[PDB]
Amino acid sequence: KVTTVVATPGQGPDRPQEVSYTDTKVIGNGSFGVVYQAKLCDSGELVAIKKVLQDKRFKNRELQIMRKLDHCNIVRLRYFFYSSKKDEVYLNLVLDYVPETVYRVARHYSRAKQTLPVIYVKLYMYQLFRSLAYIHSFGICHRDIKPQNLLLDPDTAVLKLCDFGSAKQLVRGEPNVSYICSRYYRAPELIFGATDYTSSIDVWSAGCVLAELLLGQPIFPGDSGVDQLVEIIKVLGTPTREQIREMNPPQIKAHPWTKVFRPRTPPEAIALCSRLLEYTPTARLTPLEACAHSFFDELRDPNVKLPNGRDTPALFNFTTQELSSNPPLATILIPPHARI
Numbered sequence: 001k002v003t004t005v006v007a008t009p010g011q012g013p014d015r016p017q018e019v020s021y022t023d024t025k026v027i028g029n030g031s032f033g034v035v036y037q038a039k040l041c042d043s044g045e046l047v048a049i050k051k052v053l054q055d056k057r058f059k060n061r062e063l064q065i066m067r068k069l070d071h072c073n074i075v076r077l078r079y080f081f082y083s084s085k086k087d088e089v090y091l092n093l094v095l096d097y098v099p100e101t102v103y104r105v106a107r108h109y110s111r112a113k114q115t116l117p118v119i120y121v122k123l124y125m126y127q128l129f130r131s132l133a134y135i136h137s138f139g140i141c142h143r144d145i146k147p148q149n150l151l152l153d154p155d156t157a158v159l160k161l162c163d164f165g166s167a168k169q170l171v172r173g174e175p176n177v178s179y180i181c182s183r184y185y186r187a188p189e190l191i192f193g194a195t196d197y198t199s200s201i202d203v204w205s206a207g208c209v210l211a212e213l214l215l216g217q218p219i220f221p222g223d224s225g226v227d228q229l230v231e232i233i234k235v236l237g238t239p240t241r242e243q244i245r246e247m248n249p250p251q252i253k254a255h256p257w258t259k260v261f262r263p264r265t266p267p268e269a270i271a272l273c274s275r276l277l278e279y280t281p282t283a284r285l286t287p288l289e290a291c292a293h294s295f296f297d298e299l300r301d302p303n304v305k306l307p308n309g310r311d312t313p314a315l316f317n318f319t320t321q322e323l324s325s326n327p328p329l330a331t332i333l334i335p336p337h338a339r340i
């Protein structure tokens, strides 16, 4: 069975074309709407199709956001199109399919009582920081950074941020809902009900992923709204008066970072963690600063290879958009051996 529709490319000029797909199977049902997998008849490539009922009253936030984005580490919007019998219009987004995710892989290692090799931790986290450096540069905050939303090709080690259904252009001045992100990854501002939060919530979240990958399980598996802060405090100790005020306007000592992770955990991984998982939002590294961190130096080694022996994926092909927030870091990030 073959399905043919008139779809507008996601990035590229706004002129529709006949697009044809087959082998359509439901592999999802969510907040957004339904997700299908399918095969494009031209290329034979695999794709995800998210179908969402859209009132023609409203413009769709996710679509508006996805059209702005082109990056090696972000799931591409290939096409979009509409479909229908009560005068219901459905928006279909047609996206890169990627077979696995960081959740699934991390779970295989955990269910076999093992650690994911630090090299993949470097690769994945590095590429996660790029994807966030790039989206924050438009003032788009993901608001749902977690391992289930990190697509992963196991052969190439290419990581791709997906699911922008919670994402949003942040506008200084306009309040934003506080009960956002999954709990375990939720920044403490948000727990405290802040409505004036920054894209740095994604960085706290990314810090939670890093730690999870080092530990083999989520670092802050809290109970509720407010117990989630208790779990945080178990590790970071009680925040000081200033730290609270910087987040938004019960006493335990800070458990030393070193003693959180199993021993023989690289000290620079723990250093990075401690600079992401900060109470004070502004005290957290920028995504770009985080890519610059010493933890990722092995990637800037010119001999660095995948375990399976192949070349690393694209790590340095930075754009000016992407370098926006601090261009002098280009000197550290693009290392000598790769220019022309």
Ligand SMILES: CC[C@@]1(c2ccccc2)C2=C(CC(C)(C)CC2=O)Nc2n[nH]cc21
Residues within 6 Å of the ligand: 027, 028, 035, 036, 037, 048, 075, 095, 096, 097, 098, 099, 100, 101, 148, 149, 150, 151, 162, 163
């Ligand atoms: C098909 C949709 C999916 C996804 C959707 C939302 C978050 C993460 C991934 C997804 C997979 C493989 C999967 C993890 C087995 C199932 C699945 O939900 N790969 C994808 N590529 N593009 C979108 C996807």
